[PDB]
Design a protein around this ligand. Sequence first.
Ligand SMILES: [Mg+2]
Ligand SMILES: [Mg+2]
Ligand SMILES: [Mg+2]
Ligand SMILES: [Mg+2]
Ligand SMILES: [Mg+2]
Ligand SMILES: [Mg+2]
Ligand SMILES: [Mg+2]
Ligand SMILES: [Mg+2]
Ligand SMILES: [Mg+2]
Ligand SMILES: [Mg+2]
Ligand SMILES: [Mg+2]
Ligand SMILES: [Mg+2]
Ligand SMILES: [Mg+2]
Ligand SMILES: [Mg+2]
Ligand SMILES: [Mg+2]
Ligand SMILES: [Mg+2]
Ligand SMILES: [Mg+2]
Ligand SMILES: [Mg+2]
Ligand SMILES: [Mg+2]
Lengths: 257, 144, 149, 129, 146, 172
Amino acid sequence: GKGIKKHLKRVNAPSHWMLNKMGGQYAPKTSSGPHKLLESIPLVILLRNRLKYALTFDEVKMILIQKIVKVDNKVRTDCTFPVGLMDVIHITKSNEYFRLLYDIKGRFVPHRITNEESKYKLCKVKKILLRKGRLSIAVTHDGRSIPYIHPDVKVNDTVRLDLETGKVLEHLKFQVGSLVMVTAGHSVGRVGVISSIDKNMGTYDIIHVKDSRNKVFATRLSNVFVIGDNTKPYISLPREKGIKLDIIEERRNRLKA
Amino acid sequence: GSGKPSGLRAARKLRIRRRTQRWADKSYKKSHLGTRWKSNPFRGSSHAKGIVVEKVAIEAKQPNSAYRKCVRVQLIKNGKKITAFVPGDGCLNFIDENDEVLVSGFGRSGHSVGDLPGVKFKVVKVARVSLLALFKEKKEKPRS
Amino acid sequence: RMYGKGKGISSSTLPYKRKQPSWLKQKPSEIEDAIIKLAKKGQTPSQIGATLRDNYGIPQVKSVTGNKILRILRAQGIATTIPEDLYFLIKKAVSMRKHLEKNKKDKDCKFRLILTESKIHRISRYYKRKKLLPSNWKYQSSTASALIA
Amino acid sequence: VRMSVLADCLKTINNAEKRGRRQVLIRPSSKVVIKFLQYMQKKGYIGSFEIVDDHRSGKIVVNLLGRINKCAVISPRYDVKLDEIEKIITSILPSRLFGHLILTTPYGIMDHEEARRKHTGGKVLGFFF
Amino acid sequence: DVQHERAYQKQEGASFFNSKRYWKKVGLGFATPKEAKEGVYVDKKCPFTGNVSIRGRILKGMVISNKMKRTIIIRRNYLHYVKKYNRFEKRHKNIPCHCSPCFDVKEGDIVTVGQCRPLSKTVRFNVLHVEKHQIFGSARKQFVLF
Amino acid sequence: RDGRHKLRLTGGKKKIHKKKRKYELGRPPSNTKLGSRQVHVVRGRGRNYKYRAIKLDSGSFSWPTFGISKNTRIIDVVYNASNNELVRTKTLVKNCIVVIDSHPFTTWYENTFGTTKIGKSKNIDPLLLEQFKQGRVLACISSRPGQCGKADGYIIEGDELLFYKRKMDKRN
RNA sequence: AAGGAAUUAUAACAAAGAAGUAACACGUAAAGUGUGUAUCAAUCGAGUUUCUGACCUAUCAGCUUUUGAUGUUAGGGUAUUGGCCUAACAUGGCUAUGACGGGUAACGGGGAAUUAGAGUUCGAUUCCGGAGAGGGAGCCUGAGAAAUAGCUACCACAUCUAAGGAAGGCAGCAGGCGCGUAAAUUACCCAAUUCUAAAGAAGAGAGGUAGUGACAAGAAAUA
RNA sequence: UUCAAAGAAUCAUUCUUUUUAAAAUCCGGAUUUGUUACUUUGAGUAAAUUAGAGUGUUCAAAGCAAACAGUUAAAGCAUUGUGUUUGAAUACUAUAGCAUGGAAUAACAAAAUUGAACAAGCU
RNA sequence: AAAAACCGUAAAUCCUAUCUUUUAAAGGAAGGAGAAGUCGUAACAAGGUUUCCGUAGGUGAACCUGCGGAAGGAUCAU
Ligand SMILES: [Mg+2]
Ligand SMILES: [Mg+2]
Ligand SMILES: [Mg+2]
Ligand SMILES: [Mg+2]
Ligand SMILES: [Mg+2]
Ligand SMILES: [Mg+2]
Ligand SMILES: [Mg+2]
Ligand SMILES: [Mg+2]
Ligand SMILES: [Mg+2]
Ligand SMILES: [Mg+2]
Ligand SMILES: [Mg+2]
Ligand SMILES: [Mg+2]
Ligand SMILES: [Mg+2]
Ligand SMILES: [Mg+2]
Ligand SMILES: [Mg+2]
Ligand SMILES: [Mg+2]
Ligand SMILES: [Mg+2]
Ligand SMILES: [Mg+2]
Ligand SMILES: [Mg+2]
């Protein structure tokens, strides 16, 4: 007939799933949801390939059936629910809290995290709609609509967003020296300060992001996620702290162990 | 001067001349003309199956003196009549006057081979038994 | 040579010193006036230059006057609509055509006429590319004769 | 007619070297040609040369040290990327240890090694051994 | 004569009766000409005066034709590299563009055109800025690398 | 039917290699007329219903000068810049000039101030006034009745009105 | 309040106006869930669309335009743009930088082989895209089909029939005949990988496991 | 059509710093200046294949795993309980498009039967 | 609901026309191969009329002849 595609082939699966070529013909195909399949990750992968709590899809399903895994604090029983960049996972029985982050490679790690910090999540606004009764609503990368957002919030900036209640805490403008994480090409794990934004007329607004080794790298503004003010990040970053080393340096590090 | 243009923006001429000239290469022409499929018994194939029509002798090229034993066969595929030389010291009689022969090329694409005038084909199986096998004889015997 | 097999190199070649020589008494204004007079009298650029060189004591109008002679003519406003060389070519062509009309069997002449036409078309094209000719100017074998004047 | 002054000049130089001249009158000087000559001088292959100014395209006369094996232009000044260089040099010049493959590069004309050091490849003028 | 059609050529987005003629800016630093702001003429597919927003590609060309009504042809001349011969070759492509009578464009004039929606069977572009330029052969034959 | 099957601009036959994909739908024209109201529903793409008016009368007509609107029977079609056939057949489309039963506007005017929210000061045309005197006024249609299912329109005014009158002009 | 740019968000006024906002089902959590529902946004996408990029042929040089060819206007239609279709008006558009034909033993690409470097050939075939379900054409349902283990019709094949009628479409998996130089079992299972469902618990010739297998590929006896 | 010049390091050469004109901009000091080709950096691209890093599948083709400590505990770290370290890099993804540093080489644009720059005056 | 009418998609069948593609045919006329066949001796030597070109006519056949060319001539030469 011809409509949408329900299946995903295991080689056509996006690399940072890190699936096998063997070990299956297909991949899980993230449900539609709050994240873009190419930059998400289904819950199945998390449960089975990352934490390794499950050996199989079946086990994951079973786990889900006990209403014990929460993603952003409300439960999910959909095995192929997409988790995505910043989202806190609360596996209830272990009393583990994870937050998904990026590695210095493209790969999702589940970070491990405290009760206290778990209660919020960072969310970058994308669009800021006006709706009926001249009320503004931000729309986050979490595919979530924040209504009655504080007026000073502008199109690219992140927002520290509470989970227990839908309301926001604080917001961090997209400034010239704002601690930033990346979430797309090459420099994906990378975490920097920002030197400069280009602001091209018709095109993508390219930005340059100085690291803490002072290695500058550029990136589209699209795929940059504000994470702090110049001093401190508002989230716990992984062990590497977004310092994508050179290849040689990495090898040296590996050797020294 | 070279003959060819060596301009930076010359590429069109360079390509075009090559495209026209390729066709002077005999081998290239053989490969890329459409008359290959038309004017060839095997019709672009390794072998072909033909029932035999006539066990026949062919006198060799002048210097050498033999009557080479050929088999004029009709391809089932194509309805084409072709002479196919039969190898072996005494392997004309190993085939019947009507036998489903499997005939290959002689080794030189179309081009004819050795002493033989214009026989471009080598029968290499009769009634599904291998001519070579029959010749050896220790291996096999013609089933009928 | 553009058309023959001629390969000669007979040429004017000017001297190294291009600030006018000591012995040249003529002030520029006078020379300009003289040039103007020559132009009025019917002479063409090249011819004018030649006259200046020979009859008056002056090698090159470019060394006495900052400007070349065509430029000064233009400034004074007595420049031809139709450039020197081109005009000459046209004249030649016209002459050839008359001969052809008179005398139909001349093959060599015809061949040479074609060559001159071609050269005109080159020259003509060049002038069009600048702004000496107007873009509306083909050269016509029918008109040609009238054009020269 | 002339097209590439530089090429002609280089050919002349080569001829002179072959004969075993000493002096040689490169007949239309060009900024590019001058630059090339300077480069050559720097890497030892050529001696002094007295770019004589006429009031036209100048003449150079150039002093030769009997040292050049060949020098040449490679017409079609192929744009050449920095990665593409190595293969080109392999193709051209007799040894990796010596000879020079001169590029015009947005940082002036310089040899392949120089280009590599810099980072920019550019259009490829010529070479010597 | 402004009203030439069987219909009344109005200008959508004008607002005649109430309020304190209509044109817009089109962006990408392309200055709305005097002839759009002044000078009545109605055009549904003028970038400035009409209702088409230019967006997507912008590419300079060189006009070959004015023969169509409010519509122009522009050959882009460019160089297709062929890796076998490591050489280039002149190639081209005739983009039809909508004009709008703010621009008086004789042939051989350089233009730049923005994209815009499909305006007709082939015209997906409209001319935003017309440089003057002069031509001597046929525009057909002028290569201007661009 | 919204698709290819058409020459290539160079005038070369596009050799077709694709059926007709339903999303290239060209469902046929509702020649919507005058009469008592009657409208069908056609089911466009994502259950997006659209209302094929096939007979009509009582469209919403606006009066732009004063920026108001009223629902009136429309009594005749008188011009169609597409084609005269449509007008002959009395078919309503998105730029048909038609005649409104124009008592409502007059009534409204009377109610508000005089006899033939309020930025009044403009106070009517001569031609328009004359038209009103006979009861019946020329007015464009502005909805696309075939899609929207309403004959919404507006009263034709000043310059445009004059032009339409000229077009209409009778004469021989 | 944005966006480079708005006839954008939005706000007001005058008119119309769908659909909706629980006459539903569990017993749950630390008061909850399922099912449904207007608009918005996200998402899984889709359609169109810009630019650039292809093999052989000039013993294909003029093509396209009544039959929409090129454009303008107005409409109709579409989910939306658009000769997409209609009407009216222009006479355009493409072309020796190869139009238009013809051929391809042509699906495209990622790639494969072979190369020092260039290249040459191949790419039905693990993925992405396109197309098609004997041949065309037409519809219904539906968010999505111009669906083919949906339907209507004709053509071409063809099965049962008590002769009245009836159903049928392996380019799914096996399997068979034919064609052929040329290609495997009418196997076992949902365990893995996934999908669908009223979503652990059911299904799946998708998929996997064996069987045949000197297609290739690797290791390795015969001392 | 801005050529050049001078200083410091190194083993005649290499890499670096500084200035030598004109116009606009900023509180005597300090900082922008044709277009495109070309080139350099990026950005953005599916993986599978390819090159390539790691990893004794017994080797290898592979695969994307693994390694480590123990006849069953130490050690760590957690406030009796909890294995730990990790890996699944990187490059290739045109000839076009995107942004980008550019001094050379190329084009083209600017430029006199006349072309524009200022200071004054008038509208 | 059947049935009907009109546009509009429009299968299919038939008729031409054109094109493409294989394919028959008396005879004609080439080509290649073969066989020590017939007739000459054309060419290779000044090959017994130097050869060869283009063209025209001729003739069993090679070929001959005319006209103008060439040396790839048998003359680098008075
Ligand atoms: Mg289909
Ligand atoms: Mg010549
Ligand atoms: Mg000379
Ligand atoms: Mg029409
Ligand atoms: Mg095919
Ligand atoms: Mg393929
Ligand atoms: Mg096939
Ligand atoms: Mg079939
Ligand atoms: Mg179908
Ligand atoms: Mg089936
Ligand atoms: Mg069927
Ligand atoms: Mg089968
Ligand atoms: Mg086989
Ligand atoms: Mg299962
Ligand atoms: Mg004699
Ligand atoms: Mg003889
Ligand atoms: Mg003789
Ligand atoms: Mg006789
Ligand atoms: Mg005779």
